[PDB]
Amino acid sequence: QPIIQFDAESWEAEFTQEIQDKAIEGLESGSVLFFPKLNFPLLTEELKFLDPTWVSGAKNISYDPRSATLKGVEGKSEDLRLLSGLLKRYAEKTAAFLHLLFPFYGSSLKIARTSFRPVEISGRATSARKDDTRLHVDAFPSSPTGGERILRVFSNINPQGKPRSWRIGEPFQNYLNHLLPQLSPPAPGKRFLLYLFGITKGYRSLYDHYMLELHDKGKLDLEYQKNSPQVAFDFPAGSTWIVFTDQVLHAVDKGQFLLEQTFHLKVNALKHPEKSPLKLLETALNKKLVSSESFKLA
Ligand SMILES: O=C(O)CCC(=O)C(=O)O
Ligand SMILES: [Cl-]
Ligand SMILES: [Cl-]
Numbered sequence: 001q002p003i004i005q006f007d008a009e010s011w012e013a014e015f016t017q018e019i020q021d022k023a024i025e026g027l028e029s030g031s032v033l034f035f036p037k038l039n040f041p042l043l044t045e046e047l048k049f050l051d052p053t054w055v056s057g058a059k060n061i062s063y064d065p066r067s068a069t070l071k072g073v074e075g076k077s078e079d080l081r082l083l084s085g086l087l088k089r090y091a092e093k094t095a096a097f098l099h100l101l102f103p104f105y106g107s108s109l110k111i112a113r114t115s116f117r118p119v120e121i122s123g124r125a126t127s128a129r130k131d132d133t134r135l136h137v138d139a140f141p142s143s144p145t146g147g148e149r150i151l152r153v154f155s156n157i158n159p160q161g162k163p164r165s166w167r168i169g170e171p172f173q174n175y176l177n178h179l180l181p182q183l184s185p186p187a188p189g190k191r192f193l194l195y196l197f198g199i200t201k202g203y204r205s206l207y208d209h210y211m212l213e214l215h216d217k218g219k220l221d222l223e224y225q226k227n228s229p230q231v232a233f234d235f236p237a238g239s240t241w242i243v244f245t246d247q248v249l250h251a252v253d254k255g256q257f258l259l260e261q262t263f264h265l266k267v268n269a270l271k272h273p274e275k276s277p278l279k280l281l282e283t284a285l286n287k288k289l290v291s292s293e294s295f296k297l298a
């Protein structure tokens, strides 16, 4: 059940506990939660941002709700204020929706960066490792997680009705098993140097090392990319979806105009921690993969 469809149409939707249970069980099992009727409307004064020329550099436009800081775009202060307001509203609406849908996580949901992506996917071309037309779980070389989950909310805001074309791959445990013969330990001392030199924000844990290896080696495995089990799904304009992108294999093939919000969640806040990439990797390699993990005496 790679995609679980929900009826909720509002960012303030009321959920029964039965729907909450369906959502958390599906999310933690590695399904995409799909809300075809959950549109994120833009204000008239924001429609001008549906324009790829707002991107000023190599990265997409980003907003940090914790610090109220907008990056990746240049321009007049007034335009930057409006664009910050758009991404801040996305941060607020997604955060409220997640608290309505996932009370089990309580206050453990920690918001991270908002992304606005106005460039058409089908014209993109990057290095193999950065090429998100290749199935991957999310792992970012400059930003180790220390084991925390990467939970993402996505909304297709295309104003011409164009879908966002994804592919969704096989379960994480099967992906890990497929790539296990290709995994290797880090070179001794290298991660410490990456930290000392400011290449990584924080220290890259062994977990983050292996997630990066899965991400990178999986993208370079051309036979796996072509032949592994996967479903193609078009997320319609005006829809929203929610997914642990560190667990669900995903790729994007085409589309334009997306809002995305990242949240972090500690593994011990999950309903079924044993389903997390951290615990699956720790079991598969029989070792502790994050030295900063808490210790449970019993
Ligand atoms: O742009 C998209 O639709 C998805 C890209 C992706 O791989 C991600 O956001 O993690
Ligand atoms: Cl539903
Ligand atoms: Cl100005």
Ligand SMILES: [Cl-]
Pocket: 188, 189, 190, 191, 192, 193
């Ligand atoms: Cl090291």
Ligand SMILES: [Co+2]
Pocket: 132, 136, 137, 138, 245, 250
């Ligand atoms: Co991704």
